[PDB]
Write a protein that binds this ligand. Structure first.
Ligand SMILES: Nc1ncnc2c1ncn2[C@@H]1O[C@H](COP(=O)(O)OP(=O)(O)OP(=O)(O)O)[C@@H](O)[C@H]1O
Ligand SMILES: Nc1ncnc2c1ncn2[C@@H]1O[C@H](COP(=O)(O)OP(=O)(O)OP(=O)(O)O)[C@@H](O)[C@H]1O
Ligand SMILES: Nc1ncnc2c1ncn2[C@@H]1O[C@H](COP(=O)(O)OP(=O)(O)OP(=O)(O)O)[C@@H](O)[C@H]1O
Ligand SMILES: Nc1ncnc2c1ncn2[C@@H]1O[C@H](COP(=O)(O)OP(=O)(O)O)[C@@H](O)[C@H]1O
Ligand SMILES: Nc1ncnc2c1ncn2[C@@H]1O[C@H](COP(=O)(O)OP(=O)(O)O)[C@@H](O)[C@H]1O
Ligand SMILES: [Mg+2]
Ligand SMILES: [Mg+2]
Ligand SMILES: [Mg+2]
Lengths: 388, 51, 346, 348, 146, 193
């Protein structure tokens, strides 16, 4: 609603231009007349104080044991039906003291404890679902840290980050930004790394959900979480929703699923609507990451739902060296290990294997209370990770 | 009656309890004397292997 | 004496004022007003008596209301923490390094990923290696996976939260209970913690062939959990674990390097290990002099941790059928015959 | 006059009172109690109530108009009454069990023996089992053994049925489960049987219907009360089920009932011992050979064995005879075992 | 088992209220008779007659069956391809008959709570019996007859 | 504050005296449902939510025709007298399906579906608008249309567009909302609709 700050962010002069001065003095004159305008009338008309008298009378009209209940329906204004504490419905009378605006059908209502009526709305406790996927800040991974993938970082920048920092570009050519991005590649290529990189330099509520939690126990509590996921995203202003391992909504079978595949499909048919249905969309951008782009219904990937398909290949030899350097940056090597010699250990190392080598190297140096990794540590590190 | 599902439904474990009561009052800790029961069914295969 | 008579004379007039409701204050509000939920009854927003400072009125706790003009009277004794209820339904026995047998190399390898990264940070940053988050313990059943996991969660002063489904306890962690990433909502509140996740759902003898089944809701748990402790997670004091009898049936995702930082090994005890294991569980009965335990270990080739702690206990039982008060050598020898020799088939 | 004020405060006792429950004492002259109407009240305790009776959850009488402790009732219960011999004893000897020595011995060493020779277990060092589960095929002789234990027992026996613990009045089930354990403690040597525990302990729990939220409390109350035994009160719990696969794992952990006594289908040896013990009380004739009947590959556990004898003699009354001939048993086996066509000899 | 009113303060029987039926079951009794004469249906001549002689005729000529001692047939199932005139005959037969025409449905007897479905079936037949000769039509029987 | 503090100027507009004039003279009622209309003259049978099934007649101002069986009606909190009929209860999840804001797309952003659009307007955009044309002939206009085709062809656009010009109420349904946990209430959402 209204914003307490930012009375007039007219910083267009951005200098000592006199235009800044004229507006400021305007309020000062209005303030002066208001001062004696309120106190003067507050003496010969000592009916309402507006500071202690106003609040006082309403409190008496309220009750000491204020009740809490659920508003069930909105009958004509000044009248509503509110569900009592346990199981009863009362045709209460709405009092004007309430804002009369936050009366959503089912949020909350405060009622007098004897003549039950509407006395006031109650803000709804942050539902546990919102807190579950409300990623605050990406801990450490920056955007120059990712390294390697270069032509693939421009697509994500140009779909989920540019339209929020420089909208003019998709503002003068009359082109709406590409709807979504789907990331696909072998197991371990930076798919999620780039996914959390965008969360770093972003100004929107990031939400993350893995494909495995989209499949639930009871029937119907399937394509109902999908509705909740996109209901939270809309309520939270600009937001990037990240679905990870989307290939778990029909690639993995779980006994907890009361309904079998037939139930999982209806989850997809609800996810299909939530990405492109005849409802309004607003500002919500979907990033889907998967390691098997060939095992999902070719309608979830239809242009319009997800537009830009980004392909993540196994690291190139030149990029392999960059991966080692970034991961080994904060490591006191023993000027005896050569990075180039370990670049060729197996025909194709994902890159997540590179970090595994550089992380097991340290654990192989801790065992000897040594703060310098030698070629022996890496040699045994390169065998304990990608061999067994 | 029924077969006492494993992984049944919410309002199906309750019917299971009723069977476990009709089941226990037939032959339980207090033998029932001079009360004979007659049961009929068109599908005597879904019955629990305790009835 | 005059005062005592006066007090007892006013009790009759005192034990008639209506009692006080007992409620729980979900969240404090403004203007020295609190919002409490009463026992089998609806929520209420109630004023607070001036004797009690609003600062003391904290999130969930037990309070009182007068009788009809509800007003907080006293901050009653605190309610049982919801997590402690989870640790009471599930009963992972408390264990220490002393009742650890034959596993000395494994004990060293467990303290390096759950103890050092917790009790001694700024040592893993001296090498630049990110802290390990998640250890997979494998081996035959009863080898001691849970006995060691609790020990490392007992000597590091970290809460030991076990998640195994059990929808009976699926109300102390989350009322909604929609996605597994709700245990964290309580995990990050209880200081450093270890999220054990056991396995062995009667596997190894059932569901060998196809038909129904599929996946395992003890394996999909980390894939959800480990996907969050590897990035989008602020409090870096939570670490996960599994115990599984097989490492060749793990999904292709849990075996990708970079997810599980360490894969400890739990083999069936050897001769020098069974003797030590037998010794620990044998220091609980009135053993006789000169019980040759080295001879008992030989007689049991293959016993993870339970076929051994099934000879000590059954040895005592065999000393009861005779009506004796001392456990003799014969009792232990006759015990291995039952647990191992007679039970070898099937 | 002090003696007069003491005898005047008793007016607060009165006849019409509401029985509550003691939960926790907050300080001297005050306590927290739970009314049977369903609530938790902050009341004030009378200054003449012997605090020694203000034990953990117990029976306390509260004033009707204004809740306030005014007495401490002796322990009691509602739907759990100890079996007081009379016509309510099982009436089944151990000699009527068809040779289940291995199973019979196990129950003896885990239920009967500890109650009598309690001090021996401490001397040897073993920790007595605190509850035995009785799981097996449907009709292998589970309840019958318990029927025998209740007979040759020197300790009180308390019988319950699993479905009895869930009732219409919300919040009454937890109180009923709690009264059984409380009543089983007053008579220290006692055995608690919860038959058909499948109806109270099942893994699946859908927490929206209200029938499952009331069963989530019964099971939780059982678990809470089975952890309150301090290794000094001998109240053994015997729990008999048919499908162990449905039991919540939390109920089969140390401290709870941890002694799984399997009751499998009788083997050839046992089968011969069952026909003999059942046929002992029958008339029977010389020409009847039991061996010919316990020779087949069929798997008949304990009831079709009784059904065979039951129907075999049943045939005798058809022609008005008081002996059972071999011609009678033959006609009985073919109408009781009814072997299935399972075979398809082309598979072997 | 009868329904009886009781004084609110000093409980005491004052009247015997008429038997109550579930609000759902009362809403399935047709009051506005459909207007569809038998001449509206075409082709189904050998089948319209077979129904009128098993559900309507035995209701107006009881003197005829009792003369020959044959119990009238119970029930008339109507099956066929998706659209052939099944509901037209039922709607038409609800017009050329001066009797209660309790109109059931398919998915409708199905209710979530245990035993709620039985109530709507026992109550849907007690009501018809409580009234004059009645025809109870159960359309879309698959939902409750699988 | 933080509960219901509204524009303070509106509170005095609330006429606190009238509020007191309304927080006493106006008796608060309780919702109920009528089951029977026991004959004699009044004698209505009532069923409050979770208290009991009482017997009530009327107060003074509700016409007998104003009340009918199975109709929501409020009742007194002391003597249980019907005072005002109440609307029927519509499941909130089914009442949220009604579109309140027209989608911002018209019948000029779909191209190539000239024949499809024309055939989709004589069954959803002409029987309602200009409903007298068909009266001067015996025609019951077709009621219902199935739009099928490969994904991303325009099935929803031609539907989102019709809602932009339609005068009658437009009701959404996704086909997955009609899947619910318990047996039964997946047809309630199709009966209430
Ligand atoms: N190209 C890369 N550049 C930098 N780091 C990389 C690269 N590829 C993998 N990594 C590292 O691999 C580690 C573990 O795997 P990672 O999270 O990157 O997997 P992913 O590529 O998103 O795959 P998946 O979708 O299978 O989870 C990350 O912490 C990341 O730093
Ligand atoms: N060894 C046996 N000797 C004598 N009777 C036996 C034997 N085994 C089984 N029976 C017969 O089995 C019948 C049922 O036994 P019991 O009442 O103990 O039930 P159960 O097998 O435990 O049943 P459930 O498992 O369904 O609860 C008894 O009437 C008894 O005569
Ligand atoms: N004929 C058309 N003219 C213009 N745009 C079109 C046309 N057909 C489809 N589109 C485009 O299709 C997008 C939306 O597709 P829509 O959801 O309507 O297709 P669909 O095949 O009916 O969907 P689905 O099968 O996924 O429910 C819009 O961006 C719209 O511009
Ligand atoms: N090395 C050991 N020393 C002593 N006891 C052990 C050992 N290994 C297992 N145990 C016994 O096993 C029990 C727990 O076994 P658990 O870890 O659950 O086996 P598993 O890992 O096969 O599930 C403990 O009570 C403990 O006494
Ligand atoms: N013989 C017929 N004469 C006229 N209309 C018919 C005939 N058969 C079917 N219909 C048409 O079919 C519609 C009724 O369909 P119906 O047969 O009730 O479907 P179902 O068989 O699935 O119940 C009516 O609108 C009617 O006009
Ligand atoms: Mg990934
Ligand atoms: Mg039974
Ligand atoms: Mg569509």
């Amino acid at each position: 609603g209204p914003d307490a700050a930012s009375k007039l962010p007219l910083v267009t002069p951005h200098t000592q231009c006199r235009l800044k001065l004229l507006k400021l003095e305007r309020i000062k004159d209005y303030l002066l007349m208001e001062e004696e305008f309120i106190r003067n009338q507050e003496q010969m008309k000592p009916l309402e104080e507006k500071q202690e008298e106003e609040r006082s009378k309403v409190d008496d009209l309220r009750g000491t044991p204020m009740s809490v209940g659920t508003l069930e329906e909105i009958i004509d204004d000044n009248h509503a039906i509110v569900s009592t504490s346990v199981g009863s419905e009362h045709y209460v009378s709405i009092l004007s003291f309430v804002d009369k605006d936050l009366l959503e059908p089912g949020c909350s209502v405060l009622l007098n404890h004897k003549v039950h009526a509407v006395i006031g709305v109650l803000m709804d406790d942050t539902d546990p679902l919102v807190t579950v996927m409300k990623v605050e800040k990406a801990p450490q991974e920056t955007y120059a840290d990712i390294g390697g993938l270069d032509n693939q970082i421009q697509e994500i920048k140009e779909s989920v980050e540019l339209p929020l920092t420089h909208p003019e570009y998709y503002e003068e050519m009359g082109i709406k930004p590409p709807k979504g991005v789907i990331l696909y590649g072998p197991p371990g290529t930076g798919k999620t790394l780039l996914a959390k990189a965008v969360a770093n330099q972003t100004s929107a509520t990031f939400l993350r959900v893995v494909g495995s939690e989209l499949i639930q126990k009871y029937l119907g509590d399937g394509p109902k979480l999908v509705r909740e996921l996109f209901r939270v995203a809309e309520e939270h202003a600009p937001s990037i929703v990240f679905i990870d391992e989307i290939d778990a909504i029909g690639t993995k079978r779980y006994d907890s699923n009361s309904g079998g595949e037939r139930e999982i499909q209806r989850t997809m048919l609800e996810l299909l609507n939530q990405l492109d249905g005849f409802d309004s969309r607003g500002d919500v951008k979907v990033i889907m990451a998967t390691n098997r782009i060939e095992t999902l219904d070719p309608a979830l990937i239809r242009p319009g739902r997800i537009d830009r398909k980004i392909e993540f290949p196994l690291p190139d030899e030149k990029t392999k060296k960059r991966i080692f350097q970034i991961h080994t940056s904060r490591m006191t090597l023993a000027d005896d290990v050569t990075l180039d010699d370990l670049i060729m250990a197996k025909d194709d190392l994902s890159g997540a294997d590179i970090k595994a080598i550089c992380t097991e190297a340290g654990l192989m140096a801790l065992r000897e209370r040594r703060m310098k990794v030698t070629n022996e540590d890496f040699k045994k590190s390169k065998e304990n990770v990608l061999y067994k | 009656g029924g077969r006492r599902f494993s992984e049944g439904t919410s309002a199906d474990r309750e019917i299971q309890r009723t069977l476990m009561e009709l089941l226990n009052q037939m032959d339980g800790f207090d033998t029932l004397h001079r009360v004979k029961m007659i049961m009929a069914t068109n599908r005597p295969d879904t019955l629990d292997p305790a009835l | 004496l005059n005062a005592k008579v006066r007090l007892l004379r006013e009790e009759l007039q005192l034990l008639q004022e209506q009692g006080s409701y007992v409620g729980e204050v979900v969240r404090a509000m403004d203007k020295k007003k609190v919002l409490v939920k009463v026992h089998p009854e609806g929520k209420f927003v109630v004023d607070v008596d001036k004797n009690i400072d609003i600062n003391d009125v904290t999130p969930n706790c037990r309070v009182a209301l007068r009788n009809d003009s509800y007003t907080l009277h006293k901050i009653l004794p605190n309610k049982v923490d919801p997590l402690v209820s989870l640790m009471m339904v599930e009963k992972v026995p408390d264990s220490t390094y002393e009742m650890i047998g034959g596993l000395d190399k494994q004990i060293k390898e467990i303290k390096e990923v759950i103890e050092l990264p917790v009790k001694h940070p700024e040592l893993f940053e001296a090498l630049g290696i990110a802290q390990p988050k998640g250890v997979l313990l494998y081996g035959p059943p009863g080898t001691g996976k849970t006995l060691l996991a609790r020990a490392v969660a007992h000597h590091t002063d970290c809460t030991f939260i076990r998640v195994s489904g059990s929808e009976l306890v699926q109300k102390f962690i989350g009322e909604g209970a929609r996605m597994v990433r709700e245990l964290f909502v309580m995990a990050r509140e209880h200081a450093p913690s270890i999220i054990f996740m056991d396995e062995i759902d009667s596997i190894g003898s059932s569901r060998l062939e196809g038909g129904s089944g599929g996946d395992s809701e003890v394996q999909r748990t980390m894939l959800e959990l480990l996907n969050q402790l590897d990035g989008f997670e602020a409090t870096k004091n939570i670490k996960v674990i599994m115990a599984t009898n097989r490492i060749d049936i793990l999904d292709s995702a849990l075996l990708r390097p970079g997810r599980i930082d360490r894969k400890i090994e739990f083999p069936p005890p050897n001769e020098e290990a069974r003797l030590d294991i037998l010794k620990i569980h044998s220091r609980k009965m009135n053993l006789t002099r000169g019980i040759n335990l080295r001879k008992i270990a030989e007689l049991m080739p293959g016993a993870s941790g339970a076929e051994v702690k099934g000879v000590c206990t059954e040895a005592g039982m065999y000393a009861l059928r005779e009506r004796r008060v001392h456990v003799t050598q014969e009792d232990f020898e006759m015990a291995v015959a039952k647990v191992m020799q007679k039970d070898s088939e099937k | 006059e002090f003696l007069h004020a003491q005898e005047e405060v008793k007016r607060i006792q009165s006849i019409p009172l509401v029985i509550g429950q003691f939960l926790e004492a907050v300080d001297q002259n005050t306590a927290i109690v739970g009314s049977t109407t369903g609530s938790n009240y902050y009341v004030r305790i009378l200054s003449t109530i012997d605090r020694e009776l203000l034990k953990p959850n117990a029976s306390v009488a509260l004033h009707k108009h204004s809740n306030a402790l005014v007495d401490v009732l002796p322990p009691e219960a509602d739907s759990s009454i100890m079996m007081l011999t009379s016509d309510q004893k099982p009436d089944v000897m151990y000699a009527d069990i068809g040779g289940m020595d291995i199973q019979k011995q196990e129950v003896r060493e885990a239920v009967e023996l500890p109650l009598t020779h309690f001090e021996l277990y401490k001397q040897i060092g073993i920790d007595p089992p605190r509850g035995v589960l009785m799981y097996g095929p449907p009709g292998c002789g589970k309840t019958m053994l318990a029927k025998a234990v209740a007979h040759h027992t020197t300790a009180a026996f308390i019988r319950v049925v699993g479905s009895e613990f869930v009732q219409k009045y919300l919040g009454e089930g937890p109180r009923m489960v709690r009264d059984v354990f409380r009543l089983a403690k007053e008579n220290a040597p006692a055995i608690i049987f919860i038959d058909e525990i499948d109806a109270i302990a099942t893994k699946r729990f859908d927490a929206q219907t209200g029938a499952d939220r009331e069963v989530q409390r019964i099971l939780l109350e059982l678990l809470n009360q089975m952890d309150g035994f301090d290794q000094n009160v001998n109240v053994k719990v015997i729990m008999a089920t048919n499908r162990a696969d449905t039991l919540d794992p939390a109920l089969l952990r140390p401290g709870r009932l941890d002694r799984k006594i399997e009751f499998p289908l009788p083997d050839r040896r046992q089968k011969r011992l069952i026909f003999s013990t059942i046929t002992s009380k029958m008339n029977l004739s010389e020409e009847v050979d039991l061996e010919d009947y316990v020779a087949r590959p069929d798997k008949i556990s304990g009831a079709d064995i009784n059904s065979i004898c039951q129907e075999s003699g049943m045939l005798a009354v058809r022609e008005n005879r008081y002996i059972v001939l071999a011609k009678d048993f033959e006609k009985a086996y073919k109408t009781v075992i009814k072997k299935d066509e399972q075979e398809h000899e082309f598979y072997k | 088992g009868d329904l009886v009113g009781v004084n609110k303060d000093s409980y005491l029987i004052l009247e015997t209220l008429p038997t109550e039926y579930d609000s759902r079951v009362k809403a399935m009794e047709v009051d506005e008779r459909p207007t569809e004469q038998y001449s509206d249906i075409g082709g189904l001549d050998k089948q319209i007659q077979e129904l009128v002689e098993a559900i309507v005729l035995p209701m107006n000529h009881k003197e005829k069956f009792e003369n020959l001692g044959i119990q009238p047939p119970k029930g008339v199932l109507m099956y066929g391809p998706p659209g052939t005139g099944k509901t037209l005959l039922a709607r038409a037969c609800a017009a050329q008959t001066k009797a209660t025409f309790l109109k059931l449905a398919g998915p409708q007897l199905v209710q979530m709570f245990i035993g709620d479905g039985a109530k709507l079936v026992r109550d849907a037949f007690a009501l018809a019996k409580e009234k004059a000769p009645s025809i109870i039509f159960i359309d879309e029987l698959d939902a409750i007859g699988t | 504050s933080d509960t219901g503090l509204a524009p303070p100027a509106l509170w005095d507009l609330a006429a606190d005296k009238q509020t007191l004039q309304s927080e006493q003279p106006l008796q608060v009622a309780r919702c109920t449902k009528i089951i029977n209309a026991d004959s004699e003259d009044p004698k209505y049978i009532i069923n409050v939510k979770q208290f009991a099934k009482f017997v009530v007649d009327l107060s003074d101002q509700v016409a007998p025709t104003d009340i009918e069986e199975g109709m929501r009606v409020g009742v007194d909190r002391n003597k249980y007298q019907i005072h005002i009929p109440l609307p029927p209860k519509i499941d909130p999840t089914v009442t949220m399906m009604q579109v309140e804001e027209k989608p911002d797309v018209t019948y000029s952003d779909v191209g190539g579906c000239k024949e499809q659009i024309e055939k989709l307007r004589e069954v959803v955009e002409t029987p309602l608008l200009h409903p007298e044309r068909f009266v001067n002939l015996g025609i019951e206009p077709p009621k219902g249309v199935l739009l099928f085709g490969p994904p991303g062809t325009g099935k929803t656009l031609c539907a989102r567009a019709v809602a932009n010009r339609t005068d009658a109420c437009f009701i959404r349904v996704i086909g997955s909302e009609l899947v619910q946990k318990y047996v039964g209430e997946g047809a309630r959402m199709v009966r209430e609709l």
